[PDB]
């Protein structure tokens, strides 16, 4: 045989399933009301013009329009929808 | 060897007691848009033997189209079906025997 005697202190097999987050609708994309725009951990992207978020910080459009992003540094990064004609 | 989809719950309630089905009066439906197809005196039997029914039991008219005047016997009509031919037609109905 020439056998051994291995074992496992394995106390690490583990992990949660991916939750797929991020900017789901980048800037410039025409969107209908309700389209969640961003899935975020915290408030990585603050809600802007015509954009609301719920319990899990999920930001979504409030009207029909184009998506526009914006940096405000000390203020933060915002995402909003500008309607049209 | 998983679960099929015998996973979905049987909502279909009120289903099968034991002696069996319950002998209850069935009502075959027929629109008058398929009725005006002819004229005169339209009543059960006169149907079945043609068009719809066939011992289908109770004859309840109703429907779209626009039936013309001609006393039409039946077992039931719609709050619509009535008014619809109320313009000119018949109110034959029920039974007492």
């Amino acid at each position: 045989m020439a056998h051994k005697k291995g074992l496992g202190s394995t106390r690490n097999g583990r992990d949660s399933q991916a939750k797929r987050l991020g900017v789901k609708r980048y800037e410039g994309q025409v969107v209908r009301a309700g389209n969640i725009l961003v899935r975020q951990r915290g408030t990585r992207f603050k809600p802007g013009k015509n954009v609301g978020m719920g319990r899990d910080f999920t930001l979504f459009a409030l009207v029909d329009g184009v998506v526009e992003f914006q940096d405000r540094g000390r203020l933060g990064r915002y995402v909003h929808v500008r309607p049209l004609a | 060897g998983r679960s099929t989809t015998l996973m979905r719950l049987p909502k279909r309630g009120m289903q099968g007691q034991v002696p069996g089905e319950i002998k209850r009066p069935r009502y075959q439906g027929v629109n008058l848009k398929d009725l005006a197809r002819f004229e005169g005196e339209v009543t059960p039997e006169l149907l079945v033997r043609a068009g719809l029914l066939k011992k289908g039991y109770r004859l309840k008219i109703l429907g779209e189209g626009e039936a013309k005047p001609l006393k039409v016997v039946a077992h039931a009509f719609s709050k619509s079906a009535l008014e619809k031919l109320k313009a000119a037609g018949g109110e034959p109905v029920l039974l007492e025997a």
Binding site: - | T5, L6, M7, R8, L9, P10, K11, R12, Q15
Partner: protein, 63 residues
Amino acid sequence: PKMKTHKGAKKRVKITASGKVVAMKTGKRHLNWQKSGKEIRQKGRKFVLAKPEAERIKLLLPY
């Protein structure tokens, strides 16, 4: 010989007209899951995509 209809399937699914298979919502069946969450509300009927093609074939006669 004369395929027999699959009772169980019949007991839990109503097939509409245009050929859609529709059944209830798993999850709420008298909770057993328990203490609400306004979720209980969202339980009407539903369309079983792709799995009805199979569902259906089990009711060949009963239609």
